[PDB]
Amino acid sequence: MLSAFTARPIIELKPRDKSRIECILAYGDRVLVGLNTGSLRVYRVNDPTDLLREIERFSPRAIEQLAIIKEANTLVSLSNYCVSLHDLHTFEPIASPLPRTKNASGFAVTSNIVKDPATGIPEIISRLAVSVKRRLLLWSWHESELEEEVKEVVLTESIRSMTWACATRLVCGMNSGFVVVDVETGTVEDILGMPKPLCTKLADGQLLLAKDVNTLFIDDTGKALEKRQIPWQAAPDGIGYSYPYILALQPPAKGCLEVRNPDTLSLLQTLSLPGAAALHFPGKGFHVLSDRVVWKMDATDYDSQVEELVRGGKLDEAISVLTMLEDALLKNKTETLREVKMQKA
């Protein structure tokens, strides 16, 4: 229906290579690949990739998850079922393991600009939240300085997914359902309207929740929205958002990626990515990783997308896409939109 993104492979392991990819991290020019052997490769993205540095025995076991906080110049790694903080550039350990992170399931990182209530000065605040059984551990950086106190919230069930709704609220997903946690006040709220609980952040403080084939739309406060359920045939393995589209990753056996409209819920695009098992997000594209290939998703310019929709006769979809987009991303959103509306009538 639409060529929203173009898929090109930037990293390829060979079929009989003993190493497999477990997670990646892309920041600027660089892509950091964590392997099942504990090694950590660093790639430079050219304009496909050049292997700059391999750190074997970075962690004595597989690297499950990677993140960074740029203010503190810190690399967060989930390995040996614990969490470790390394220097982003020398990769020497700052704190490995991080205290109380033993048997951690995962973590979620955010960093936002917040104003001091007393002085009203913009300050960069960083949040790292780790899931350890039914416990939620919260570290924070104030001006890249890690605070000496760790906040802990105890839940009623084990945490299976963690997605930051905003700078102060975190959506946590368990088996029974989803909850909203206020990291500042430690207050938990129930969300009202083996399958993994999926959650991704949309635009304008909106979030999409998915369990099996059921879906729900909420806001940054965690209140339900009057929206239809997304009509996809099978439950997605993962979900994500790349402005302005919703992305759904089907199980690795199918090896497909769905690009859907958050407004009309129609299937804009389907991409065949064999073995694709995870999505990686930060108007620039995202990444999709298999156990051997890392593809970079390049978004087509939105003017050509709307022209393609108009040429196909999908007028209502072009109107919805145009309404969603910011005006600076189009040559002339106003006149293009009025034109498409006059083509409809």
Author numbering: 1 to 47, 96 to 241, 271 to 359, 369 to 431
Give me lines lifted from the publication on this model:
Lysosomal fusion is fundamental to cell survival and requires HOPS, a conserved heterohexameric tethering complex. The heterohexameric HOPS complex mediates fusion of late endosomes, autophagosomes, and AP-3 vesicles with mammalian lysosomes or vacuoles in yeast, and is probably the best-studied tethering complex. Five out of six HOPS subunits (Vps11, Vps16, Vps18, Vps39, and Vps41) are predicted to share a similar architecture, comprising an N-terminal β-propeller and a C-terminal α-solenoid domain. At the opposite sites, Vps41 and Vps39 bind to membrane-anchored small GTPases (the Rab7-like Ypt7 in yeast), while Vps16 and the SM protein Vps33 establish the SNARE-binding module.
To address this, we first analyzed the N-terminal β-propellers of Vps41 and Vps39, the likely binding sites with Ypt7. The intrinsic low affinity between HOPS and Ypt7 prevented reconstitution of the complex for structural studies, therefore, we instead relied on AlphaFold predictions. Additionally, we solved the structure of the β-propeller of Chaetomium thermophilum Vps39 by X-ray crystallography, which largely confirmed the predicted model. Cristal structure of C. thermophilum Vps39 (1–500) construct (cyan) is shown and superimposed on the model of Saccharomyces cerevisiae Vps39 (dark green) generated by AlphaFold. Surprisingly, in the AlphaFold model, Ypt7 binding occurs at the α-solenoid of Vps39 where it does not directly interact with the β-propeller, as originally expected. Furthermore, the binding site on Vps39 is placed approximately 5–6 nm above the membrane if Ypt7-anchored HOPS is in an upright position on supported lipid bilayers. Membrane-bound Ypt7 can still reach this site due to its 10 nm long hypervariable domain (not shown in the prediction).
